[PDB]
Amino acid sequence: MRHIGQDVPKRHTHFVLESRLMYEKSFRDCWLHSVCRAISQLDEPLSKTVVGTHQKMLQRKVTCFQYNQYGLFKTPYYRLANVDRYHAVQGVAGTREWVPYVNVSYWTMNKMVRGGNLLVHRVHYTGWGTDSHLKKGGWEHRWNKVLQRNVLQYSRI
Amino acid sequence: VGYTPVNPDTSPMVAYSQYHWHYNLPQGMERPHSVNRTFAAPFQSNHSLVNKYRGVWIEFDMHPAFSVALEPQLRKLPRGRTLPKTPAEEVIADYTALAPLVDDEKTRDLWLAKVFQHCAFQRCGGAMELWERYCHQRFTAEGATAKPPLSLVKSVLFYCNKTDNSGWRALFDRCLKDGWNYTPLFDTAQWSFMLKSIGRMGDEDGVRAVLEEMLDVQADLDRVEARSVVIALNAVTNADVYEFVKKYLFNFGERKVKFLRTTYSDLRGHGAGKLRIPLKENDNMYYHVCWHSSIRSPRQFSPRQLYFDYTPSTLGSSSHNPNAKIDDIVKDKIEKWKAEGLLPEDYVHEDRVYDRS
Amino acid sequence: QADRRTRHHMMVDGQINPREWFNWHPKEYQPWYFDRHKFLYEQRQYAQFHHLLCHQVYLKDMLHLMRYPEPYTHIIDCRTSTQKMHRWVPHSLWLPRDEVEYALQLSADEFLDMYGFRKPDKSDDVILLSHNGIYSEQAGWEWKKQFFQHVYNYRGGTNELFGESYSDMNVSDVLSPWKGPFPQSGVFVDKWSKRKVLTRTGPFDRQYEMQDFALPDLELEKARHPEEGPRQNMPFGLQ
Amino acid sequence: SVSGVFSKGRGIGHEATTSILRYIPRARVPWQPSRFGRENLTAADMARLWSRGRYRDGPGNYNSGYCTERTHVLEENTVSIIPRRELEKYMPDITIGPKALVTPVSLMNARNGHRVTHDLLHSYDPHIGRLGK
RNA sequence: UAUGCAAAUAUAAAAUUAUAGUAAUUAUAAAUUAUAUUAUAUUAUAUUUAUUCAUAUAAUUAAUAGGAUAAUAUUUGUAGUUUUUGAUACCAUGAUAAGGAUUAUAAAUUGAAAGUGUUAAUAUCAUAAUCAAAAUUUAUUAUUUAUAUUAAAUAUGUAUGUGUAGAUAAAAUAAGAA
Numbered sequence A: 001m002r003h004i005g006q007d008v009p010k011r012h013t014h015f016v017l018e019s020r021l022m023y024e025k026s027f028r029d030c031w032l033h034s035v036c037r038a039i040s041q042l043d044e045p046l047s048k049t050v051v052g053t054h055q056k057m058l059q060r061k062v063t064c065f066q067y068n069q070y071g072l073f074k075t076p077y078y079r080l081a082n083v084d085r086y087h088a089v090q091g092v093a094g095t096r097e098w099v100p101y102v103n104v105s106y107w108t109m110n111k112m113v114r115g116g117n118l119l120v121h122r123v124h125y126t127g128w129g130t131d132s133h134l135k136k137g138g139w140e141h142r143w144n145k146v147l148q149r150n151v152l153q154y155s156r157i
Numbered sequence B: 001v002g003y004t005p006v007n008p009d010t011s012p013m014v015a016y017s018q019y020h021w022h023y024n025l026p027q028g029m030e031r032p033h034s035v036n037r038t039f040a041a042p043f044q045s046n047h048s049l050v051n052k053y054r055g056v057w058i059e060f061d062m063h064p065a066f067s068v069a070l071e072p073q074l075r076k077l078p079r080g081r082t083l084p085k086t087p088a089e090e091v092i093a094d095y096t097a098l099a100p101l102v103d104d105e106k107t108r109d110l111w112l113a114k115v116f117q118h119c120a121f122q123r124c125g126g127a128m129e130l131w132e133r134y135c136h137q138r139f140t141a142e143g144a145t146a147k148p149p150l151s152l153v154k155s156v157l158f159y160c161n162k163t164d165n166s167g168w169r170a171l172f173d174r175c176l177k178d179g180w181n182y183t184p185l186f187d188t189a190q191w192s193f194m195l196k197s198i199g200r201m202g203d204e205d206g207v208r209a210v211l212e213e214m215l216d217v218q219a220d221l222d223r224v225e226a227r228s229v230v231i232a233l234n235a236v237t238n239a240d241v242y243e244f245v246k247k248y249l250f251n252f253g254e255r256k257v258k259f260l261r262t263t264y265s266d267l268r269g270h271g272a273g274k275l276r277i278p279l280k281e282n283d284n285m286y287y288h289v290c291w292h293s294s295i296r297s298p299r300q301f302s303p304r305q306l307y308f309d310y311t312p313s314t315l316g317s318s319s320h321n322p323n324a325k326i327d328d329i330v331k332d333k334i335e336k337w338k339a340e341g342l343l344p345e346d347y348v349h350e351d352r353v354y355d356r357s
Numbered sequence C: 001q002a003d004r005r006t007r008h009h010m011m012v013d014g015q016i017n018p019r020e021w022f023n024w025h026p027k028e029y030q031p032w033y034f035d036r037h038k039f040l041y042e043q044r045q046y047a048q049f050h051h052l053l054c055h056q057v058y059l060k061d062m063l064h065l066m067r068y069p070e071p072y073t074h075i076i077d078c079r080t081s082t083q084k085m086h087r088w089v090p091h092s093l094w095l096p097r098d099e100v101e102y103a104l105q106l107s108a109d110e111f112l113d114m115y116g117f118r119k120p121d122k123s124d125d126v127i128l129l130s131h132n133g134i135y136s137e138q139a140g141w142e143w144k145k146q147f148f149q150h151v152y153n154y155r156g157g158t159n160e161l162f163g164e165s166y167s168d169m170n171v172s173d174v175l176s177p178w179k180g181p182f183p184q185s186g187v188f189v190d191k192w193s194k195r196k197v198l199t200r201t202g203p204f205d206r207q208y209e210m211q212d213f214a215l216p217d218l219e220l221e222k223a224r225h226p227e228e229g230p231r232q233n234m235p236f237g238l239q
Numbered sequence D: 001s002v003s004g005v006f007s008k009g010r011g012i013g014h015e016a017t018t019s020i021l022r023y024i025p026r027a028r029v030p031w032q033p034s035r036f037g038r039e040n041l042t043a044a045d046m047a048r049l050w051s052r053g054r055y056r057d058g059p060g061n062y063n064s065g066y067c068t069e070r071t072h073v074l075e076e077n078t079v080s081i082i083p084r085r086e087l088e089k090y091m092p093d094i095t096i097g098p099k100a101l102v103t104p105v106s107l108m109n110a111r112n113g114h115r116v117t118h119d120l121l122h123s124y125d126p127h128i129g130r131l132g133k
Numbered sequence E: 001u002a003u004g005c006a007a008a009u010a011u012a013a014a015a016u017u018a019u020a021g022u023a024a025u026u027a028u029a030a031a032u033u034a035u036a037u038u039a040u041a042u043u044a045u046a047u048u049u050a051u052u053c054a055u056a057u058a059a060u061u062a063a064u065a066g067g068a069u070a071a072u073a074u075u076u077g078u079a080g081u082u083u084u085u086g087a088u089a090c091c092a093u094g095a096u097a098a099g100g101a102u103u104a105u106a107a108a109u110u111g112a113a114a115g116u117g118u119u120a121a122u123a124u125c126a127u128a129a130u131c132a133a134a135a136u137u138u139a140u141u142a143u144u145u146a147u148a149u150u151a152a153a154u155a156u157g158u159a160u161g162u163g164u165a166g167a168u169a170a171a172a173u174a175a176g177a178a
């Protein structure tokens, strides 16, 4: 500690591990927090079994439990900073300084593509690439096609 | 380039260089590999077998008619992996009151073996009178010719080991090869219990005899629990049996000796509360076990610790040493010449230079 | 505080510092087992002779052969210095190791008329006995070089068979301290960076480490080191 | 001219094994012979180091509710901690205790192997929270 | 601005400088180096549109450890403090960007290598790092203009003033310009 015999060239690389740990905490708490939030603010009666006071008292108690839950992962994903795992450079998702597939910053992506470190193919800079969906509608169309392939393809039981 | 390494599997430049397969060249398997077939390792698990019985089995098997007849009595005796908590004196009284009635030597022996097992589980030392009442007259006395059942002898050994009784030798000597020859049928659990009991009892010759018999009969030293071996080897103090233990310790495997050292250290240190009876201090055996583990284990390299006090030669470091002795080399040469005989033998040599210290 | 034996300087007293983790060829770090308690010729010193080692024969086998002999197992007593030998091992034939190199080159009659017995036919088993089983092993090397099918060595030999103490080829397990500098034959140069690197040989090697290692007996070990710790010349965290 | 992050440390094994085990050399790591881990820290140093682990809602943070300092200097302007009694007047007190943090085994699978809501991930293997014990 | 007063480069020569003593030779030459289309001729340039531009916070980076249906390891629960010193709040070698002026129709692309914060040898008090709810003074940024106006993570109260000074931005590619 205190930069005495540091092994990693960059101190900030440990923030990547910290971000992974916060993602794991989100994995733990994403169900309990969502269930508590859903129960707390549901005005309509839950069912025949619980109505009126038996429901409002339960909502108050579950909200109290959620508040008492120390260390619950409240923060959303979009507000968690993204830091490269190669050079610990911060980039914000949605801009051009971060790529979604490789999870590395713009500078790291440029360095890796300019060297040989990531098998990618070159396309025209002012085009829509080679994907049919991108040519058809663009980013939103390919996003919707990903949704359709994932969920809407299945006739759920 | 840089401090961060480059992974060749992900980097396409390495994968497509002249030292790997280019993507234009056909992609196909080259030199199929068979590692699991040429030399397959046995399954050694770091974690112990969870479903193991972890105890001595008595091989209870009697005639079904006798078993169902004695079922009301046998409910109190232990069943397969089921141990009732009936008081031991109750079953002892039931046996001493009902054994003459049932006319079957094998059934009586099995019932007495179950009684011994139950009283051993309860650690009730009063049941040896049952052995003296029933078995001692005909199975082991003044050259008894009877052949006791394996179940009964195993149960008696388990009971005597549990109660730390001093009468186990009279039965073990009969159970050697020249007598009953029941040694090869003893389970590794039985051997571990015997070793632990003898180590607690502090018998110097018992441990040596048991270890030699185990090696002779091919008992599985690796599967014998480490704690029993540690307790057995803690009690040796005499020089002869200590030398025997030193030469015998090479039979165990490398992992076994390493974990023997680990268990010995933790038990005589932090794990002193693990044992019901604290272990006596035997620093000689502790040091020898640690040393033997160090010998057996592969030796790493620690150059700084090895050569911390290393000093170069006088002639090698003369230029870098301000006050070093150089006439010592001439003196050594003169001594070598005198030993060779070229110089006169034992000729008086005066100092060639001043002494600067 | 800082010391010449604790700092990282590459060169001390003009020679390569052996106290640097980066100053040693990587093959030295590879795991290895102690072998000083093994047989003399099974130790790592005879690396070029390891491929020529003979098989074994034990006391039980030797006693069984003495009680019940067989026509085609030549028991060769390869002991020199006839003044030392007193007893006769049964069913033994005298073929000294100092003469075996030429003896194995002779023909059948050429060997019979010189040694009083015929050639072992290069197919029958031969079992070699000598003091401490040293000359017997050295002779078994020659027999194997002459391509005899079955050559066995009796480790311990007549010395352990008759309970005497004869030490042919007097050799001391310990070695005298390396008074000279590090030999040039042990200096390793990197094939890429061309840096000078050391090797476990000369002044420091595995034999020196083994002979310096601690004794098995605690009461004898405590005699070597002084009171209040075995090693106090070094800092607390380097021991 | 010697500087040190921690001025005192304690050993792991007590005075029943080390006195005999010291005679056997230990092959320490060649490039770092002296090591100093968390299990080797003193009680106060280990406590103050573990308090600083959590980003917030932890004793290390100056304003997390579990601090112990009487005052905190903020931008060259001293400030006084509002005690729990004074906070209670306008902050309603809801507190269940250790039972609230823990969750049932049937919910452990849904919570992905975690039975504790504590912000430090608790693992049941005896190797991650590996202190001396 | 020739009337007087005034020999004067058109060369008989001996390495530079110097009173014909001062220093150690002195000069000179060639090649190359960013300033100058010419008026049919390897291209008609000349039109449209636009310009009130702003944001960063609460300190500890230096180990491996396997579990059900497997012929048996409590290795259940694996326990040896302390001699080193840089990418950190300067500095601590290299490396990718932006920047259209002459190789043209043709079976064709209108974006450059001359270098842009993070990356691989110089050290010598350095704990500066997001996990929410936060503090314009800083060159490099296309905002919605007068029928209907705040519901889900909390999300902009300011400047109506004759399409209005100076200064300045963009486009000759499925578009329409000679």
Ligand SMILES: O=c1ccn([C@@H]2O[C@H](COP(=O)(O)OP(=O)(O)OP(=O)(O)O)[C@@H](O)[C@H]2O)c(=O)[nH]1
Binding pocket: B196, B225, B227, B274, B275, B276, B277, E074
């Ligand atoms: O290998 C192990 C590990 C742990 N133990 C623990 O030892 C405790 C008792 O301590 P001991 O193991 O010293 O007593 P004992 O000789 O009477 O034990 P048994 O042979 O009858 O088992 C027991 O309660 C058990 O959990 C073992 O007996 N053996």
